[PDB]
């Protein structure tokens, strides 16, 4: 796989792991999103250090107001925080 292709298939398979066992086959749930993001980004993203922080994200992703997160919602989330990291990385150069 190419560097970019490498990253596309990764988000798609890891999401299948939590989403198809502790929840709906093709849909995520309030507890599945928290587990997927924290397990590998526990110390990074703001989740466990701020249980409230996970809730702010669901609100932003609860666009349908379904109380669940679709792969179209989750992928939008990881994509938007990493970009914020590059901008705050140049603040201290």
């Amino acid at each position: 796989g190419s560097e970019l292709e490498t990253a596309m298939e990764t988000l798609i398979n890891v999401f299948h792991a939590h989403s198809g066992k502790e929840g709906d086959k093709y849909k995520l749930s309030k507890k599945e999103l928290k587990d997927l993001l924290q397990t590998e980004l526990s110390s990074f993203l703001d989740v466990q250090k701020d249980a409230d922080a996970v809730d702010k994200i669901m609100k932003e992703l609860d666009e349908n107001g379904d109380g669940e997160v679709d792969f179209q919602e989750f992928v939008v989330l990881v994509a938007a925080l990493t970009v914020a990291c590059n901008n705050f990385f140049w603040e201290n150069s």
Binding site: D46, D50, A53, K56, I57, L77, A80, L81, F88
Partner: peptide, 12 residues
């Protein structure tokens, strides 16, 4: 607040 990170809130 240092003991905790509110960066994701940056998104909101």
């Amino acid at each position: 607040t240092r003991t905790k990170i509110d960066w994701n809130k940056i998104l909101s």
